[PDB]
């Protein structure tokens, strides 16, 4: 390309599609049509060349008028793009390709009485609005108004061979160009042109001619073609300016008082259509979107819009379900019918707007299009002969149209059902052969993609076979209508006869398709044959179909015998001649006794159905003679089938004796007494099922020997001899009562039947038992199906994902907004920064001499002691007086300054405290029921560190529980996943509050049989809580399933001091101080259910039976503790070293988990120390022994904490006397 913006064609000044038509006139200069296309999508434009237009280019006013006119989007057509470039000054408009008159000739079917009046009304409204816009004078031609799938008329400013519509004023007043007069025009000229155009639209041919203009000059015209319409038209026709056309006055002179309001609501709906009707101008997908949206909104508004004009209570919609709710809102599609075309149109209802919305519904932008087309099929409710034909014609087209979704067939079947609900006599003689061909078209469309289910459509069409017979009756109605004339009754009779003979072939094709669908195997079609058998009354043809269904019943008796049951139950509805086949049906019942229990119930249904209407007495007498004997089964349905024997006996004395022969009821009198008889006939079929198992076992055994000591009885004789010793012991394994003495010879026939059931399979001490049934999988196969779906590979995300595209997925996005979030965001949000974990090697080897003694508060002991880890550890201890104290590690190490570096007033007694993992925050709970966490604030200066201020980050009252409970013990934890805290109530109730939202996540309660909570501990995964019991029990609970996992006990069964999860022992083992007296610490593996290592203070080894785990014991145990001073103590374990404070000798002890041998006491007495060493009595259990052999003065230790100075390790301790000390 040498230059841009150019074009290949001569007249074409810019990039566009190929050439097109054009026109010219003696009235105005020639013009040419043009098309600009986006690779196969074009609009309707007009050719104008800006290159040669630079000489004048007075397009200003025209562009203003174009902007003003096309700016609004009324019923009239609006220009797309009016513009001038450096090359092409061509104009543009939306694609139409339909002129008003040309479409009037092209669409005789779309043309209707009220339709033309509607379009003319729209044109009148548009013209009146234009007259209200203070702009007019556009030349009126038949090519101005365009039509779309919406079947609406849209007029454009450019109406461009055809007969022109002259303005009488501009004509008669024209002399030498009206003395060189400029552009002039009036609304009157538009009124006259609009008049002539309206007449041209009415008749189909215009009045424009030279002789017509001359006649207009002659002030006379011959009127030939309604009164008011003719007058209103003649007003504008006679003299435009002089006779005062007054378009507005005519708009107020509109005849219909109803039609005006209906077309007002349809004008609002036309505004909706305008919303649907709405370089870069407009998006391509915006059209489809506007379409689907227009449709959905069309229905959603069609509820109330229907309610407006000529509605009905019952309908298929939601609001229609509310309307049908008043009128009593198996499975069939039904609604308010037409009722003889709205009772011959008592309300005079004729509307083509529904057909217009259907023709607009012909397109499809989503699956909402299904409900759209369905709504159109509902709009078909208005009954019109010619209209119903096209409406029904559209439905089959829609059927054969979309093979994408299977829903198309369903919607098509729905619209077809509506067409069957039309219920109108044939207007045209074509309706017969057209229906005959309609069936063939549906047959051609019946062949389609595999795996799709046409069964429902088959049952529907088969149910519509009666409607087909009604269509034949409609052909007879056409014959009767054609017989109304003279010498045309016999002709119409012969025509109907020949058409019936030709219809026989159509019926043959239908029966052929029916037999085809029935032979298809897709068992859903067989169930679809039920409705076929129900509506089969229209078909009087031979039993051949029933024979095909019989062979189908045999092939079903092969494989699908469960479905064979349901089919046979429905097959009892045959109700046809040749009762000789009913005997074969009875044999088919004997064949139905084979395996399926559902077949037994079905045969019972057929038994009652046959009990209603009989055929032959004697045959059914012997039949029922065997069947009633076989009816003694204890099955729930077998009793029901047994009850039919009395009803059979109703239809006398000889039969009474003959029945009394086999009668099992001595006291039987009548029907009620027969009910008492059946009540006395109560038996158990469980032992009968086991007996059947013994029969199958006998079938697996050797029947070869016929020795002892074929007729009907020979089977029984061969059945009894089959076993001797085995069947005897089997008979001794049952109840073996006098009521169990019943032989039940029918169980032999059912035995051969079950032998056929076993003949459907392979050959049927002792080996593995043989089950009578097998379970479906449905589990792993579902996951594998998820792997196939993974081969399909839809999307998903665990973490946050980007915003999805707009659509129905907005519910899934709102679902993503329906899940609580930002658990992790609460971690970095507030309460300062987050430190890291710094560890140290084993500290147990050091001497551990005490280098410091400091007590801030003499008065009371500290209820809690904790330390904030790091390079410079922050010491913290509470108070019984409700005081919070904080001291600096390094400052106490070097300068040895001894005071509170920080002091916080709780104003009330504090319960406990813990430092939040990997954080600078310190959490604390107080017996006032006050739970709060204080964030740390510190600074670093002069090569050192200092503390600033202590303030509580969050405040949550534990008094808000309502029972006023005080917090017992508190343990908090932060997982990278999420962070939270857990605490024990005053009633010892486990409550886990979310650290993020400061709210309670869940509440757990230990059983009152366990007394109170003896300790608190958290699992490694923190999905489980480990808590001791004051009853001297150990309880681990899973918070995942929110239940108690296990409850353990051991030793002397006394109270448990403490419980915790050791490091080296892992989560599979827990360390618990408590239980047996002599034992200091009992470590037991949770899963193992045994105590691996028990550290005990004593001079001898304990008892093995006493040390064994206690399980079988119950809550009945009375609590027995110890008041000795050696009971209460404190322990802290970390880094493979477990430290325990011994209150016995009042000394600090340290047990190294690596070697209990090398383990020893940090601080001890003056005279001598203790020597300790372990051993193992049991393979699964070991035990450590401690053999015993004074300036420092301190009370019992209420708290202890292990710490590292980043130089050398060390321990801190707070006693019950309110004194603290440190040992390095």
């Amino acid at each position: 390309q040498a230059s841009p913006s150019i074009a290949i064609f001569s007249y074409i000044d810019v990039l566009e599609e190929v050439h097109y038509v054009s026109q010219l006139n003696s009235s105005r200069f020639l013009k040419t049509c043009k098309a600009l296309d986006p690779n196969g999508e074009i609009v309707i434009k007009v050719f104008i060349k800006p290159k040669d237009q630079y000489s004048l280019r007075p397009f200003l006013q025209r562009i203003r008028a174009q902007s003003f006119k096309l700016g609004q989007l009324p019923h009239v057509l609006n220009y797309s793009k009016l513009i001038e470039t450096n090359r092409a000054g061509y104009m543009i408009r939306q694609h139409l390709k339909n002129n008003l008159y040309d479409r009037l000739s092209l669409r005789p079917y779309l043309q209707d009485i009220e339709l033309k009046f509607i379009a003319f009304q729209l044109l009148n409204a548009l013209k009146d609005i234009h007259n209200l816009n203070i702009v007019h004078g556009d030349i009126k031609t038949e090519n101005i108004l365009v039509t779309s799938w919406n079947w609406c008329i849209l007029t454009d400013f450019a109406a461009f061979t055809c007969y022109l519509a002259p303005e009488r004023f501009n004509s008669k007043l024209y002399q030498d160009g009206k003395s060189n007069n400029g552009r002039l025009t009036k609304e009157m000229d538009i009124f006259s042109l609009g008049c002539v155009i309206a007449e041209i639209f009415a008749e189909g041919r215009p009045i424009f001619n030279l002789s017509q203009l001359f006649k207009y000059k002659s002030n006379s015209y011959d009127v030939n073609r309604s009164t008011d319409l003719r007058n209103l038209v003649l007003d504008m026709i006679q003299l435009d300016p002089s006779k005062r056309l007054s378009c507005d006055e005519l708009l107020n002179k509109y005849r219909g008082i109803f039609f005006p309001d209906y077309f007002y609501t349809f004008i609002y709906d036309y505004f909706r259509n305008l919303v649907t009707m709405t370089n870069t101008c407009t998006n391509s997908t915006l059209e489809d979107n506007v379409k689907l949206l227009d449709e959905t909104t069309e229905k959603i508004y069609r509820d109330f819009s229907q309610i407006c004009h000529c509605l009905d209570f019952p309908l298929i919609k939601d609001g229609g379900e509310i309307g049908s709710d008043p009128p009593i809102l198996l499975v069939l599609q039904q609604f308010t019918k037409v009722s003889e075309k709205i009772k011959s149109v008592k309300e005079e209802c004729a509307l083509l707007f529904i057909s217009y919305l259907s023709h607009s519904i012909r397109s499809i932008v989503s699956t909402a299009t299904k409900l759209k087309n369905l709504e159109l099929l509902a709009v078909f409710a208005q009954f019109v002969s010619d209209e119903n034909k096209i409406d029904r014609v559209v439905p089959y087209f829609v059927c054969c149209f979309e093979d994408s979704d299977q829903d198309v067939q369903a919607l098509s079947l729905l619209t077809l059902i509506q067409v069957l609900t039309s219920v109108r006599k044939l207007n045209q003689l074509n309706e017969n052969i057209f229906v005959d061909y309609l069936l063939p078209r549906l047959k051609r469309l019946l062949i389609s993609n595999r795996q799709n289910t046409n069964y429902l459509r088959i049952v529907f069409a088969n149910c519509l076979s009666d409607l087909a017979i009604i269509i034949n009756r409609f052909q007879e109605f056409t014959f009767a209508q054609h017989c109304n004339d003279n010498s045309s009754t016999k002709y119409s009779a012969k025509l109907i006869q020949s058409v019936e003979d030709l219809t026989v072939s159509f019926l043959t094709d239908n029966d052929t398709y029916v037999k085809m669908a029935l032979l298809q195997n897709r068992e859903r079609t067989n169930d679809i044959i039920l409705s076929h058998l129900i509506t089969y009354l229209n078909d009087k043809d031979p039993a051949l179909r029933v024979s095909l269904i019989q062979t189908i019943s045999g092939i079903s008796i092969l494989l699908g015998t469960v479905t064979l049951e349901q089919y046979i139950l429905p097959l009892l509805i045959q109700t046809i001649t040749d009762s000789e086949e009913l005997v074969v049906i009875s044999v088919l019942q004997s064949l139905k006794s084979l395996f399926k229990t559902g077949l037994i119930r079905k045969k019972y249904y057929i038994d009652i159905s046959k009990t209603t209407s009989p055929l032959l007495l004697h045959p059914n007498n012997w039949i029922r003679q065997f069947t009633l004997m076989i009816i003694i089964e204890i099955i729930n349905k077998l009793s029901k089938a047994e009850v039919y024997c009395i009803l059979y006996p109703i239809i006398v004395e000889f039969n009474f004796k003959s029945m009394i022969s086999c009668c099992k009821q001595p006291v039987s009198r009548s029907v009620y007494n027969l009910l008492c008889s059946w009540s006395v006939r109560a038996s158990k079929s469980l032992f009968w099922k086991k007996i059947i198992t013994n029969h199958v076992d006998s079938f697996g055994n050797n029947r070869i020997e016929f020795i002892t000591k074929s007729t009907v009885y020979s089977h029984d004789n061969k059945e009894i001899p089959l076993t001797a010793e085995d069947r005897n012991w089997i008979d001794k394994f049952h109840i073996i009562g006098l009521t169990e003495k019943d032989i039940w010879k029918i169980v032999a026939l059912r035995g051969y039947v079950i032998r056929t059931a076993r003949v459907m399979a392979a050959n049927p001490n002792l080996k593995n038992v043989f089950v009578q049934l097998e379970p479906t999988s449905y589990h792993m196969h579902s996951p594998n199906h998820g792997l196939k779906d993974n081969a399909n590979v839809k999307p998903e995300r665990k973490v946050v994902v980007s915003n999805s595209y707009e659509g129905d997925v907005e519910s899934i996005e709102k679902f993503l907004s329906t899940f609580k979030i930002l658990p992790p965001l609460r971690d970095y949000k507030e309460f300062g920064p987050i430190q890291e974990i710094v560890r140290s090697p084993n500290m147990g080897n050091l001497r551990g001499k005490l280098i410091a003694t400091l007590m801030e508060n003499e008065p009371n002991s500290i209820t809690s002691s904790a330390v904030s880890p790091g390079e410079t550890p922050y010491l913290i201890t509470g108070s019984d007086q409700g005081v919070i104290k904080i001291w600096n590690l390094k400052e106490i190490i070097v300068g040895e300054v001894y005071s509170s570096s920080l002091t916080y007033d709780c104003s009330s007694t504090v319960t406990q405290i813990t430092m939040i993992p990997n954080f600078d925050a310190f959490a604390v709970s107080s017996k006032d029921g006050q739970i709060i966490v204080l964030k740390v604030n510190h600074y670093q200066q002069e090569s050192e560190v200092k503390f600033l201020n202590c303030e509580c980050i969050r405040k949550i009252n534990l008094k808000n529980f309502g029972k006023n409970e005080y917090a017992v013990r508190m343990r908090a934890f932060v997982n990278e996943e999420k962070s939270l805290l857990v605490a024990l109530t005053n009633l010892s109730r486990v409550i886990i509050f979310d650290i993020r939202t400061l709210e309670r996540l869940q509440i757990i309660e230990n059983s009152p049989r366990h007394g109170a909570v003896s300790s608190i501990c958290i699992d490694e995964e923190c999905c489980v809580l480990i808590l001791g019991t004051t009853r001297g029990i150990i309880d681990i609970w899973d918070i995942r399933f929110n239940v108690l996992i296990r409850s353990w006990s051991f030793g002397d069964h006394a109270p448990i001091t403490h419980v915790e999860v050791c490091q080296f022992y892992g989560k599979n083992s827990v360390i618990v101080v408590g239980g047996s007296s002599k034992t200091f610490l009992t470590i037991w593996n949770f899963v193992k259910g045994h105590c691996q290592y028990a550290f005990i203070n004593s001079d001898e080894q304990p008892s093995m039976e006493h040390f064994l785990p206690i399980e079988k014991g119950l809550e009945e145990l009375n609590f027995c503790g110890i008041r000795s001073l050696n009971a209460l103590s404190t322990i802290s374990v970390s880094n493979d070293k477990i430290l325990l404070t011994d209150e016995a000798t009042s000394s600090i002890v340290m047990f190294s988990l690596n070697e209990l041998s090398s383990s020893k006491a940090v601080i001890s007495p003056s005279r001598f120390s203790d020597v300790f060493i372990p051993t193992q009595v049991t393979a699964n259990l070991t035990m450590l022994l401690r053999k015993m052999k004074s300036l420092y003065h301190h009370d019992i230790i209420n708290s202890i904490s292990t710490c590292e100075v980043d130089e050398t390790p060390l321990l801190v301790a707070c006693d019950n006397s309110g004194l603290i000390g440190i040992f390095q």
């Binding site: 599609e17 000489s55 499975v331 409900l371 051609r444 729930n636 029901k640 998820g786 899934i812 399933f1041």
Partner: protein, 783 residues
């Protein structure tokens, strides 16, 4: 199993539900049978049947109260065992098919007594308000006679058990304790309640993953109406029921006949097609109404095809000129191609001139050829390698010259379509006589000759050096010409070539490096020939053939425009040959001769004793000028300049470089006439005579052309349908443009007079506007 969110269309298959447990009301036998009681005298009075509870499942649709899903029912065990199944069941509606609007429903049908079995009813929702289908998870429900539903408390605990299935963060020891939670779910059996008129059921439908649901997608493609809808309505109006066919006649028959007289390529309307459908009588009567009526109906089903094909042999034989309309690829009908082949069974000398379009037909001859190819491969699977097509084969085997023409035509199509290469061998097998095959090999040596010319074009040297080298090559080629026997001539199939004169040959100075050699024929006369290589001459060749055909159409009018039909053809894919002519450059004739008068007076000077007039030389020159003008207007040949135009001393006006045509010009699009300012002056001084005469010949050629233009239009339709150089999807618009320049829609010939007025404006501008004068100056500058 894995949880993940997967939308409707995204999700694949149909739903299934496993159902297990219930809640015993304890008011009757545990199967809910008969309503047990000590008052049972009344139970005999009320005839209370003992019912064994079974179940059935079907889904209420959308809450739109329609019916969609399938009822389904299972077998019978004790419902006094409370019928604990966990039994799966399903139906045939996918999740992609499943409308997010939908609801489950269930009916528990027991088995009671004579014609008696009970019935209980319930309903629920399919997916979540969060769109997850029952969260793809386990549940429990409760239902009464009507207006009752399900809740979650202990079912909320069970839903947490489904959160164990829903994959909340989990571990291996947690799994063992989830076996301990199988012990816990075993402990969950402790539940108790004693309601009435309502019941509970435990039903788990845990899936792997959380569904999601939406509508189905769709496709918008090619605020508008469409083509297929009009097809729908029109086809709905196509009933034609009562089969009796009347044979009425009226004055409207003439108008209908006029309606059937329209051009072949036109697309008829609805009412016109039906009017032509009821015109079958007269349609059979008129031979020109055949093809039009054939296109007036669409054959898809065998119903229409029945009467159609039945009337195919019944109707009068159509004119062979109008037979080219139904011989296109537009109609692929078997009976159509058959009957046309039967009509084309007669092969005249004009068939040899129709061979160019027959090559196009050969390119379009393949439709669903897989079956035919497999049929040939079936017989080709035996021995190792080492339809109108039968009519073309018979015509090829008949005359050796026609066979040579078919082979030469196949040589060009061999490059574009690979099947043509083997089709040439099939053509050699189509001709039994090998007599033509020998001369075909002798003419196949011409490929090696063209390869030798390309070898001479491979080396780059001086102009004179390449000339002498071309002379030596002409001598070496002269040796082979005498060595090899006589062959078929490129100019005509009848004439045979003997040898070539080495010193009489010439060389083109152009960039294409064409070769000009005078070869003495078997008639003992020198024949100049100009050949070229490394380019596709198919454009100018087909244009030359079209010029010859049009010349025949003019000869049919018993009037000659004295236009020289220069012979042009394509030897190889890149190679082509053409008959040379005494052509001189326009710029050379302008500069050297100083006007066309002296150049025309060079060969045959004519000075009359009166007006100094010139004879049939100048007459033929003028006729050639007007004829070339008409051709340039009609065909719309572009890229025609002073260089592209040549002058033939024989009195003819030569025009070359037809590569750009059908409205395609190198510069901005000019007018139709190719007449320059020089010829406009030469005919301008003589205008009083010459312009009137040239206008007479103009109008005459217009009438003659437009009369028979239909056949040429159909032939051009098929030819363009095959394929084209310099044009691709041009073709539709090209056909259209041919019709517009032809102005077939206008019965007025005044268009030619308008073109004459334009020619009158060519000498002097009308100056309607400044831009108009600038446009005339632009056309003058372009020339």
């Amino acid at each position: 199993n894995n949880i993940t969110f997967c939308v409707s269309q995204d999700l694949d298959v149909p739903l299934k539900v496993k159902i297990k447990s219930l809640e015993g009301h304890k008011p009757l036998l545990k199967p809910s049978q008969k309503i047990l009681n000590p008052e049972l005298m009344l139970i005999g009075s009320n005839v209370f049947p003992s019912s064994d509870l079974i179940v059935s499942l079907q889904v209420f649709d959308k809450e739109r109260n329609r019916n969609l899903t399938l009822p389904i029912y299972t077998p019978y065990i004790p419902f006094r065992n409370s019928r604990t199944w966990d039994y799966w069941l399903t139906l045939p509606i996918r999740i992609k098919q499943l409308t997010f609007s939908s609801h489950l429903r269930i009916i528990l049908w027991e088995y009671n007594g004579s014609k008696q079995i009970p019935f209980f009813n319930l309903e629920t929702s399919i997916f979540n308000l969060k769109d997850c289908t029952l969260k793809r998870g386990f549940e429990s429900l409760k239902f009464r006679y009507d207006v009752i539903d399900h809740c979650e408390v202990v079912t909320d605990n069970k839903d947490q058990e489904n959160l164990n299935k829903y994959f909340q963060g989990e571990f291996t020891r947690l799994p063992w304790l989830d076996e301990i939670t199988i012990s816990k779910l075993r402990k969950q059996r402790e539940n108790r309640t004693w309601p009435q008129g309502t019941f509970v059921l435990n039903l788990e439908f845990p899936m792997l993953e959380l569904p999601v649901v939406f509508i189905e997608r769709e496709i918008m493609n090619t605020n508008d109406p469409i083509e297929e809808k009009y097809r729908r309505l029109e086809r709905a109006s196509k009933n034609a029921n009562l089969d009796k066919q009347v044979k009425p006649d009226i004055k409207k028959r003439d108008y209908l006949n006029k309606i059937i007289n329209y051009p072949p390529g036109t697309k008829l309307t609805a009412h016109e097609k039906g009017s032509i459908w009821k015109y079958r009588y007269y349609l059979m009567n008129n031979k020109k109404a055949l093809t039009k009526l054939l296109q007036s109906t669409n054959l898809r089903e065998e119903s229409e095809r029945v009467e159609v094909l039945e009337l195919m042999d019944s109707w009068a034989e159509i004119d062979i000129d109008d037979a080219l309309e139904l011989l296109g690829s537009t109609f692929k009908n078997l009976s159509v191609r058959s009957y046309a082949v039967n009509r084309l069974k007669k092969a005249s000398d004009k068939e040899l001139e129709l061979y160019l379009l027959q090559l196009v037909e050969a390119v379009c001859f393949e439709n669903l050829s897989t079956f035919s190819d497999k049929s040939n491969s079936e017989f080709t699977i035996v021995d190792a390698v080492s339809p109108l097509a039968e009519f073309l084969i018979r015509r090829a085997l008949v005359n050796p010259r026609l066979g040579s023409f078919f082979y030469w035509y196949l040589k060009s199509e061999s490059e574009d379509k690979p099947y043509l290469d083997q089709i040439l061998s099939s053509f050699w097998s189509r001709l039994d006589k090998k007599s033509r095959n020998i001369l075909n090999d002798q003419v196949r040596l011409i490929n090696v000759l063209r390869e030798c010319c390309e070898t001479i074009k491979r080396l780059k040297d001086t102009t004179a050096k390449k000339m002498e080298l071309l002379v030596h090559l002409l001598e070496t080629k002269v040796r082979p010409l005498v060595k090899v026997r006589p062959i078929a001539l490129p100019l005509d199939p009848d004439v045979l070539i003997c040898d070539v004169c080495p010193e009489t040959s010439k060389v083109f100075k152009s960039s294409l490096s064409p070769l000009k050699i005078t070869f003495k024929t078997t008639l003992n006369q020198p024949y100049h020939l100009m050949f070229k290589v490394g380019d596709d001459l198919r454009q100018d060749q087909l244009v030359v053939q079209i010029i010859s055909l049009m010349n025949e159409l003019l000869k049919n009018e018993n009037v000659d425009l004295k236009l020289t039909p220069y012979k042009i053809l394509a030897t190889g894919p890149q190679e082509g040959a053409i008959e040379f002519i005494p052509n001189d450059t326009l710029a050379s004739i302008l500069s050297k001769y100083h006007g066309i008068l002296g150049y025309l007076k060079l060969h045959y000077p004519d000075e009359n004793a009166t007006l100094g007039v010139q004879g049939w030389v100048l007459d033929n020159f003028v006729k050639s000028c007007a004829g070339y003008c008409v051709i340039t207007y009609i065909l719309g040949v572009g890229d025609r300049h002073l260089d592209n135009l040549l002058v033939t001393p024989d009195g003819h006006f030569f025009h070359a470089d037809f590569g750009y045509i059908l409205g395609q010009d190198p510069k901005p699009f000019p007018p139709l006439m190719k007449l320059p300012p020089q010829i406009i002056e030469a005919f301008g001084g003589a205008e009083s005579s010459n312009y009137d005469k040239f206008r007479s010949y103009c109008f005459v050629a217009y009438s003659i052309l437009r009369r028979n233009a239909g056949l040429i239009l159909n032939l051009f339709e098929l030819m363009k349908t095959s394929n084209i150089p310099d044009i691709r999807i041009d073709p539709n618009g090209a056909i259209l443009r041919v019709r517009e320049r032809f102005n077939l829609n206008m019965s007025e010939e005044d268009a030619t007079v308008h073109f004459q007025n334009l020619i009158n404006d060519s000498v002097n501008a009308l100056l309607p506007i400044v831009i108009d004068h600038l446009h005339n100056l632009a056309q003058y500058w372009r020339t």
